C-alpha cells in the first residue's frame, strides 16, 4: 500500500468535521490529543489501584501503572541506588549526606552513579507531570566531588561532561588540567565535550581556535583514545561560526573520517551543508558541495547515529531552492523516499519547511501539468500549504495560461485555512480580472469573485471595521459586468462611496458600455456622478461621451450642468 | 454501585410521574409538582471539584505560544469558582422567576376579554 492522497495523515480522525483544515490545526489537534493522553497517564499513575487488575494474557508490561517513588525506607547504600535509578536528585543527595554523616561506607561505583545524575541534570529535578549558564555556582555536584575520598577517571569524566552540557565551558577546561596532572586518561566522550568547550570558552580568531582543537585531537592520539562519529560531528558543528574561514578545514575533517573508517552520517553532511550555505552567492562553492554530497548519498539507507540526523533533508532542500535547481531537488526527495529514509525528515516544523521549499521550487521550475500532480500528491496528504505557496501556485498557472483552475485554487484555499488572507484574495481577483476571457470562463470567474465577496463581507474582523482594498472592489465589480451580472455590479458602486475607495478607470468605462446597451440615462449619470465625486480627469471627457451617447432629459441635463458647475 | 445508575432522562421520567393512572384522568392534582431541571445546563466539560486545569479541555491548550501543562487551582481560587457557579445558578433561577405578566380579562380568573394575537399566517403566504 502507498500513501492515500485524498486523506490527511493517519494520526488525525478521518472525519470531515474533525480533520485538520490548516497547518495550525494540524499542529494543535495533535497537541490536544497528546494532552488527553497525558491526563490519562497522570490519573493512571496517581490512582494506580484502579488500574492494577491484569486480565491480559500474555501479560502486557506497558499497560500497567508506573511507580516513581522509592520503596526502600532504610538508610543504606542499597537504598541510595534506588533513588539514583528513579533520578531523585534531592532525595539521593539527602540520602547520601545522612549516609555519610553516619560514617558508613559508600562504594565508588555508586558515588560515580550519583555524579552522573547530578552532572546531567545540573543539581535540578527532572520535569514531571504534576506535583544563560545553568551550572549553579552552589551545586551539590561540586561539593560531593570535593568530599569524595577516592576519585577515578570516570569521576572526572562525568564532571567534565556535565559542566560542558550546562555551558560551564571555562570550569570544564580547568578540570581537564587536573585530570592530566593526576596522570589519568579521559575517554572519547570527555574529549568530545572538551572540543565543544575549546571553541565556546572564549571568542578568538579562527587560527587560534583551530590550533587548540588540533592539540586536543593529538592529545587524544597520545592517550590511545579512538575518535567516534560525535568527535568529528562536534568539530563541524562548532566551526559553523567561522564560515568562510572554516570551509577548507571542515572539508579536511570529512576526508579524515573516510580514511579512518568512520562513516559520515546525515548530521555530518548537515553541518557541512550549513557551513557552506552562508549568506551570499552560493554558486561559487555551495553548488558543487551539494552536487558531490548527493552523488555520495545516492541509494543509501540511513540509520540513526547522531541527534542531528533529522536536519539534513531540511538543510539540503533549502539550498536547492536557493540554487533554483529542480533536478537536485528530485535527487534530495529521491533519497528521502528510498527505504525508510522518510523518517529523517524531522519534526512538524521541519516537515512543513521541507515541503514548502520543495513545492515552491516545483511550481517555479516544473511544467504545470506535473506541478498539478505534485499539488495533488503532497497537499493535504503530506503537508498543509502556507498562503505563500497558494500564491506561488497561481503565479505558475498564470505563466502557463491555465486560468480555468483559479476557481479550484480558491476552493482549496478555503479548505486549507486561507479564506481570510488578504494577500491571497487580492492575487486571485487581480489575475481573474486582468484580461477579458471567453464567456464560459468569464462566468466561472464571476462565481468565484462572488464567493470571495462573501468572504470579505463575513470576515472574522467583522467585529471591527471591514477593510475592503481598492483593488478587490474594482476587480469584483469588473468581473460581474463581464459576466453579465450588471445588477450586482451596479449595487456594488455604493461601496466605493461608503468605504471611500477610488474607482478604477477601466471599471467606469465598462459601466458606460453596460448602460448604452440598456439605454438607461439615469445609470449613465450615476457613473458620471461617481467619477465627479473623486474629481477624475476622465470624468470631464466622459460627460462629453454621455451627452452624445445617451438622450439627456431636462432634469438629467441640469444634473450634468450641476456637475458641469463643479467642473 | 456504578452499574445500578441510570441516565437523567430515566430519572426524570420516573420522578416526574407524567405517565400513569394519575396523569391519565388527572386523578392527581398538582399544586406542588416536581419540575424538570436540566442539570447539565451550566456544566463545563473538564470542570470538577478538585479544580484541575486540563490543557485543551477546560483551559486553552497553548499559552504564550507554548503548550500548557497540567495544573490545579488553589484552594482559594477554587472556592471563588464554586461560589460563582452557585450565584450563576440563582441568577438563572431569577431569570426564570422574572416572567412578564399579561393583562387580565373581564376578571382575574376569566379567559373572556383576553387577546390571543393575530391569526396564524396562511399556507400561501397569507397574513392577518
Amino acid at each position: 500500500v502507498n500513501r492515500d492522497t485524498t486523506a490527511v495523515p493517519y494520526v488525525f480522525q478521518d472525519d470531515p468535521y474533525l480533520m485538520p483544515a490548516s497547518s495550525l490545526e494540524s499542529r494543535s489537534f495533535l497537541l490536544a490529543k497528546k494532552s488527553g493522553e497525558n491526563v490519562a497517564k497522570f490519573i493512571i499513575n496517581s490512582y494506580p489501584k484502579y488500574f492494577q487488575k491484569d486480565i491480559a494474557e500474555p501479560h502486557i508490561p506497558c499497560l500497567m501503572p508506573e511507580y516513581f517513588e522509592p520503596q526502600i525506607k532504610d538508610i543504606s547504600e542499597a537504598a541510595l541506588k534506588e533513588r539514583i535509578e528513579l533520578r531523585k536528585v534531592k532525595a539521593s543527595v539527602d540520602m547520601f549526606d545522612q549516609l555519610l554523616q553516619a560514617g558508613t561506607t559508600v562504594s565508588l561505583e555508586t558515588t560515580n552513579s550519583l555524579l552522573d545524575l547530578l552532572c546531567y541534570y545540573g543539581d535540578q529535578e527532572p520535569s514531571t507531570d504534576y506535583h544563560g549558564v545553568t551550572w549553579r555556582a552552589k551545586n551539590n555536584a561540586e561539593r560531593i566531588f570535593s568530599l569524595m575520598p577516592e576519585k577515578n577517571e570516570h569521576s572526572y569524566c562525568t564532571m567534565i561532561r556535565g559542566m560542558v552540557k550546562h555551558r560551564a565551558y571555562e570550569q570544564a577546561l580547568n578540570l581537564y588540567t587536573e585530570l592530566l596532572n593526576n596522570r589519568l586518561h579521559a575517554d572519547v566522550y570527555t574529549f568530545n565535550a572538551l572540543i565543544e568547550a575549546t571553541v565556546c570558552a572564549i571568542n578568538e580568531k579562527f587560527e587560534e581556535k583551530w590550533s587548540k582543537i588540533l592539540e586536543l585531537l593529538r592529545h587524544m592520539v597520545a592517550q590511545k583514545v579512538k575518535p567516534n562519529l560525535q568527535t568529528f560531528n562536534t568539530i563541524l558543528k562548532c566551526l559553523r561560526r567561522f564560515h568562510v574561514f572554516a570551509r577548507s578545514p571542515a572539508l579536511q575533517v570529512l576526508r579524515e573520517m573516510k580514511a579512518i573508517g568512520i562513516e559520515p552520517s546525515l548530521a555530518t553532511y548537515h553541518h557541512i551543508i550549513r557551513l557552506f550555505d552562508q549568506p551570499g552567492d552560493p554558486l561559487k562553492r555551495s553548488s558543487f558541495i551539494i552536487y558531490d554530497i548527493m552523488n555520495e548519498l545516492m541509494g543509501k539507507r540511513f540509520s540513526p547515529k547522531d541527534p542531528d540526523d533529522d536536519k539534513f533533508f531540511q538543510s539540503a532542500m533549502s539550498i536547492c531552492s536557493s540554487l533554483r535547481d529542480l533536478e537536485l531537488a528530485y535527487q534530495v526527495h529521491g533519497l528521502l523516499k528510498t527505504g525508510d529514509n522518510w523518517k529523517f525528515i524531522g519534526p512538524d516544523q521541519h516537515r512543513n519547511f521541507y515541503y514548502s521549499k520543495f513545492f515552491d521550487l516545483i511550481c517555479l521550475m516544473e511544467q504545470i501539468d506535473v506541478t498539478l500532480k505534485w499539488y495533488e500528491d503532497l497537499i493535504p496528504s503530506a503537508y498543509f500549504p502556507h498562503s505563500q505557496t497558494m500564491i506561488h501556485l497561481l503565479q505558475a498557472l498564470d505563466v502557463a495560461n491555465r486560468l480555468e483552475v483559479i476557481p479550484k485554487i480558491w476552493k482549496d484555499s478555503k479548505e486549507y485555512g486561507h479564506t481570510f488572507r488578504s494577500d491571497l484574495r487580492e492575487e486571485i481577483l487581480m489575475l481573474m480580472a486582468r484580461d477579458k476571457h471567453p464567456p464560459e470562463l468569464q462566468v466561472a470567474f464571476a462565481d468565484c469573485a462572488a464567493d470571495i465577496k462573501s468572504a470579505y463581507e463575513s470576515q472574522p474582523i467583522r467585529q471591527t471595521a471591514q477593510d475592503w482594498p481598492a483593488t478587490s472592489l474594482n476587480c469584483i465589480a469588473i468581473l460581474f459586468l463581464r459576466a453579465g451580472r450588471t445588477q450586482e455590479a451596479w449595487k456594488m458602486l455604493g461601496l466605493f462611496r461608503k468605504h471611500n475607495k477610488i474607482p478604477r478607470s477601466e471599471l467606469l468605462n465598462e459601466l458606460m458600455d453596460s448602460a448604452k446597451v440598456s439605454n438607461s440615462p439615469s445609470q449613465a449619470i450615476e457613473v458620471v456622478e461617481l467619477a465627479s465625486a473623486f474629481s477624475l480627469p476622465i470624468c470631464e471627457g466622459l460627460t462629453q461621451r454621455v451627452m452624445s451617447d445617451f438622450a439627456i432629459n431636462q432634469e438629467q441635463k441640469e444634473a450634468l450642468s450641476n456637475l458641469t458647475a463643479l467642473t | 454501585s456504578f452499574f445500578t445508575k441510570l441516565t437523567a432522562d430515566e430519572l426524570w421520567k420516573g420522578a416526574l410521574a407524567e405517565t400513569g393512572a394519575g396523569a391519565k384522568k388527572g386523578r392527581g392534582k398538582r399544586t406542588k409538582k416536581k419540575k424538570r431541571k436540566d442539570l447539565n445546563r451550566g456544566q463545563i466539560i473538564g470542570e470538577g471539584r478538585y479544580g484541575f486545569l486540563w490543557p485543551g479541555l477546560n483551559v486553552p491548550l497553548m499559552k504564550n505560544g507554548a503548550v500548557q501543562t497540567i495544573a490545579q487551582r488553589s484552594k482559594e481560587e477554587q472556592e471563588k469558582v464554586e461560589a460563582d457557579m452557585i450565584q450563576q445558578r440563582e441568577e438563572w433561577d431569577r431569570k426564570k422567576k422574572m416572567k412578564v405578566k399579561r393583562e387580565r380579562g373581564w376578571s382575574g380568573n376569566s379567559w373572556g376579554g383576553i387577546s390571543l394575537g393575530p391569526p396564524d399566517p396562511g399556507p400561501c403566504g397569507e397574513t392577518y
Binding site: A21, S22, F420, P460 | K99
Partner: peptide
C-alpha cells in the same frame, strides 16, 4: 398564562 409570558456564518478552520 397571565402570570408570565412563557420563556450564522460557517467557515473552515475557524480561530
Amino acid at each position: 398564562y397571565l402570570s408570565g409570558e412563557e420563556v450564522e456564518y460557517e467557515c473552515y478552520a475557524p480561530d
